[PDB]
């Protein structure tokens, strides 16, 4: 069987890694290529670079990151964040990215999913889904969690697999900035509605949160927070999950 994946999320602005929450205290945390190599060195399964470079320089800056990563990294990486049309995604994939992640542009145009999949295969297309509880319903938000789209998560996930997406990146808006663990109820919720691999995002803090995420039905668990600043040893975590039944990817 296929391994459950542990994925490192590198937030990048201006070809640099950013740490913080608000851009008042967004500080430089280093080179993404060096940092990504370190994630591979320590056993992280996939990488995800999300770019929040200002709009004017976003397209150029994102292409430089992929090439600089593509020239040194030995694990799959996804690039996403502000990717609004096919040829922008074409640029990025041919420049080296294995998967491109779309959210806002995919809600505002489901067709965009099938475009990239038709030319690059489903495996190339990650759909980010930011979802929140609004009056007892799981709703999809866009514009970085700021616009209610009036679309139920339940209907969107089906459409998204229907459009030929290869993978869902599911962030719980009620759980970002939180360290109390993944939104497992939402993961449980999405799980019977799709066959796509689910990437849990938002809430991780200790090993056992990953066990909770995978119990709840995630195929992979994203996390920035923890791995640097050596809180959770990645191999520690991978052994811990192996111990309690998760089919991790373990290296002798």
């Amino acid at each position: 069987m296929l391994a459950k994946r542990i994925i490192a999320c590198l937030d990048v602005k201006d070809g640099r890694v950013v740490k913080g929450t608000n851009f008042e205290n967004l500080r430089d945390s280093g080179d993404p290529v060096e940092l990504g190599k370190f994630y591979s060195e320590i056993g992280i399964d996939e990488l995800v670079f999300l770019d929040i470079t200002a709009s004017v320089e976003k397209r150029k800056t994102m292409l430089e990151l992929v090439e600089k990563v593509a020239e040194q990294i030995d694990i799959p990486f996804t690039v996403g964040g502000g990717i609004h049309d096919f040829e922008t995604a074409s640029e990025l994939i041919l420049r080296g990215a294995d998967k491109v992640s779309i959210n806002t542009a995919a809600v505002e145009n489901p067709s965009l999913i099938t475009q990239i999949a038709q030319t690059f295969g489903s495996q190339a297309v990650v759909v980010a889904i930011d979802a929140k509880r609004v009056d007892g319903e799981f709703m999809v938000f866009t514009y970085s969690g700021k616009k209610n789209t009036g679309i139920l998560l339940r209907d969107w996930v089906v459409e998204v697999e229907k459009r030929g997406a290869g993978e869902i990146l599911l962030t719980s808006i009620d759980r970002d900035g939180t360290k109390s663990g993944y939104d497992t109820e939402m993961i449980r919720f999405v799980r019977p509605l799709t066959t796509l691999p689910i990437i849990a995002s938002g809430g991780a803090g200790k090993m056992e949160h990953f066990l909770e995420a995978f119990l709840a039905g995630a195929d992979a668990a994203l996390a920035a927070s923890v791995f640097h600043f050596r809180e959770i040893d990645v191999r520690e975590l991978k052994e811990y999950l192996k111990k309690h039944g998760v089919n991790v990817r373990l290296e002798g």
Binding site: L2, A3, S40, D45, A70, P76, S122, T195, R249, E251
Partner: protein, 200 residues
């Protein structure tokens, strides 16, 4: 160690080239060249890579007149090594491109897998008969090889389907997974290919 990677496509080939350059850094007199044309001398290691449609890439190899080349390396007992699409090309035909046949260096065919999630994608575990390290490699593929036991090299299961993720007919090697994306063991494997392809 004169290493050749066929660079015509389809798909990304610079990953493999970079991974092959990485894995070869501790070997004496390594050269890695990107081959688009027939060269007059042969390579010790020729890689056939590629990601895509079986029919194309059997097009891009005949168009640039590389079947001759590839088959010469077989007879001159060099090491010929296919990866992802390139491994599939080593067999006679495929369900992906019906009337189109290719290379036929190994006796077999390529078929679509039986899973309803059929970009087989992620880290799955390869077990080898010999030589190459056992562990989890990164797959992204929809078609599998159909061949007879003696030519199997490594076996992996995806959704109850045991299938050949690696093959060998002498000095022909094929790998279904991408070892450039396989992290430490991906480099360990590539080095073992370079090693096998040394002594002759």
């Amino acid at each position: 160690m004169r290493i050749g990677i066929i660079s015509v496509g389809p798909g990304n080939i610079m990953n493999l080239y970079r991974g092959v350059k990485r894995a070869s850094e501790n070997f004496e007199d390594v050269s890695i060249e990107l081959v688009e044309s027939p060269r007059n001398d042969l390579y010790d290691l020729l890689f056939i890579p590629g990601v895509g449609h079986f029919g194309e890439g059997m097009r891009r190899l005949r168009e640039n007149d590389l079947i001759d080349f590839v088959r010469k390396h077989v007879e001159d007992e060099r090491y010929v090594v296919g990866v992802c699409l390139g491994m599939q090309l080593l067999f006679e035909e495929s369900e992906e491109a019906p009337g189109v046949k290719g290379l036929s260096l190994i006796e077999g065919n390529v078929v679509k897998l039986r899973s309803r999630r059929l970009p087989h994608m992620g880290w799955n575990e390869v077990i080898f008969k010999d030589t190459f390290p056992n562990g989890y490699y990164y797959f992204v593929h929809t078609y599998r090889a159909v061949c007879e036991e003696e030519h199997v090299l490594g076996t992996t299961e995806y959704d109850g389907e045991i299938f050949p993720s690696a093959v060998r007919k002498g000095r022909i090697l094929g790998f279904q997974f991408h070892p450039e994306k396989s992290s430490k063991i991906g480099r360990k494997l590539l080095e073992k290919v370079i090693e096998c392809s040394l002594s002759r």
